[PDB]
Scaffold this active site. Structure first.
Site, PDB file in Angstrom:
ATOM      1  N   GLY A 244      76.783  24.845   8.796  1.00  0.00           N
ATOM      2  CA  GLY A 244      76.901  23.561   8.546  1.00  0.00           C
ATOM      3  C   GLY A 244      78.433  23.011   8.325  1.00  0.00           C
TER       4      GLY A 244
ATOM      5  N   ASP B 205      69.455  11.971   0.670  1.00  0.00           N
ATOM      6  CA  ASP B 205      69.545  12.690   2.147  1.00  0.00           C
ATOM      7  C   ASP B 205      68.188  12.929   2.687  1.00  0.00           C
ATOM      8  OD1 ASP B 205      70.809  13.644   4.347  1.00  0.00           O
ATOM      9  OD2 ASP B 205      71.587  15.523   3.363  1.00  0.00           O
TER      10      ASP B 205
END
Ligand SMILES: N#Cc1cnn2c(NC3CC3)cc(-c3sccc3-c3ccc(=O)[nH]c3)nc12
EC number: 2.7.11.1
Length: 331
Positions: A47, A155
């Site tokens: 990520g 999120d």
């Protein structure tokens, strides 16, 4: 004139009633485990701010997930840790098992409970109407719990939902963007992935709350019942609001802007245009009709509202007719 203030409709002062230590993550002291208890087995992903691995805890032979962080503000690491610890043992919330640091590299790593996940780009296309209601009810348990604990996830998306379909086990993961709700607080609108961003984020309305997660949940539900991923497919943050307006209509958007006295970015004026509010039926066809019901549509409609104050809360959503059979089977 400035924007009109807003307060969460539910769980408004739960953090105010807590001792400072609960939400004041900047003063949180991290409790560290032993890095030698864990051995990395294989890589799971990369990520922007981390690398994820599968690991073995050599003291008990248990399979774990290790998130080794890239450079991140200490207050943001303390924020994620504090939220994870506050939410430990809550329904369908991932368990933070340990927090370790490399003694030489000084690199921090979060150790989580492992979930034998079936990738959503394979799982969702196999899910029955009952599966979508069952798993939607499970995410709602996690959301009502974290909201009741004064935390917005911020999120909510398929990637942050881990499902072990074999054991009908769901975990809401990645609390790295999560925040504590404080009435009157102005939050950063540059949160969530493009497709799941609420209208409040896109119009730059900073005094948002738990209801942000409910918009995201609506986006997920729309993609699942209509078999359309993503549901609102914007080319950027400006076009993202255009994609929503083409479905919900521009009238309710300008009524929302007027209600909160929102200063709309001048870029929006020439791209928003004028659009009618569409009927959910235009997204229904032969390959998705088995997942679409009047209950599903009614529920979806009550989640996807520009006005954050008018969306269903997680508890109201659990009470919707769409979940009557899931509620019955769980008794
Ligand atoms: N937390 C957690 C967690 C539990 N299970 N699990 C699995 N399971 C599949 C391998 C079977 C994969 C991942 C992955 S895969 C790529 C990124 C991540 C990840 C891990 C932690 C985080 O905060 N965000 C993202 N995370 C988890």
């Amino acid at each position: 004139s400035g924007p009109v203030p807003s307060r969460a409709r539910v769980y408004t002062d739960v953090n105010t009633h807590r001792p400072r230590e609960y939400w004041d993550y900047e003063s949180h002291v991290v409790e560290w485990g032993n890095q030698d208890d864990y051995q990395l087995v294989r890589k799971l992903g990369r990520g922007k701010y981390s690398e994820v691995f599968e690991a073995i805890n050599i003291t008990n032979n248990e399979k774990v997930v290790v998130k080794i962080l890239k450079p991140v503000k200490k207050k943001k690491i303390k924020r994620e840790i504090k939220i994870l610890e506050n939410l430990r043992g809550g329904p369908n919330i991932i368990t933070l098992a340990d927090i370790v640091k490399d003694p030489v590299s000084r690199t921090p790593a979060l150790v989580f409970e492992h979930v034998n996940n079936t990738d959503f780009k394979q799982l969702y296309q196999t899910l029955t109407d009952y599966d979508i209601r069952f798993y939607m009810y499970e995410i709602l348990k996690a959301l009502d719990y974290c909201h009741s604990m004064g935390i917005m996830h911020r999120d909510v998306k398929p990637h942050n939902v881990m499902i072990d379909h074999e054991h009908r086990k769901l975990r809401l993961i990645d609390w790295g963007l999560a925040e504590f709700y404080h009435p009157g607080q102005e939050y950063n609108v540059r949160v969530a992935s493009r497709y799941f961003k609420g209208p409040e984020l896109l119009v730059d309305y900073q005094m948002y709350d738990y209801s942000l997660d409910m918009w995201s949940l609506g986006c997920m539900l729309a993609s699942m019942i209509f078999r359309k991923e993503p549901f609102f497919h914007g080319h950027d943050n400006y076009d993202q609001l255009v994609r929503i307006a083409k479905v919900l209509g521009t009238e309710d958007l300008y009524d929302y802007i007027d209600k909160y006295n929102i200063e709309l970015d001048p870029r929006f004026n020439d791209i928003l245009g004028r659009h009618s509010r569409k009927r959910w039926e235009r997204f229904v066809h032969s390959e998705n009709q088995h997942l679409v019901s009047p209950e599903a549509l009614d529920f979806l409609d009550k989640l996807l509202r520009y006005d954050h104050q008018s969306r269903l809360t997680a508890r109201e959503a659990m009470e919707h007719p769409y979940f009557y059979t899931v509620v019955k089977d769980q008794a």
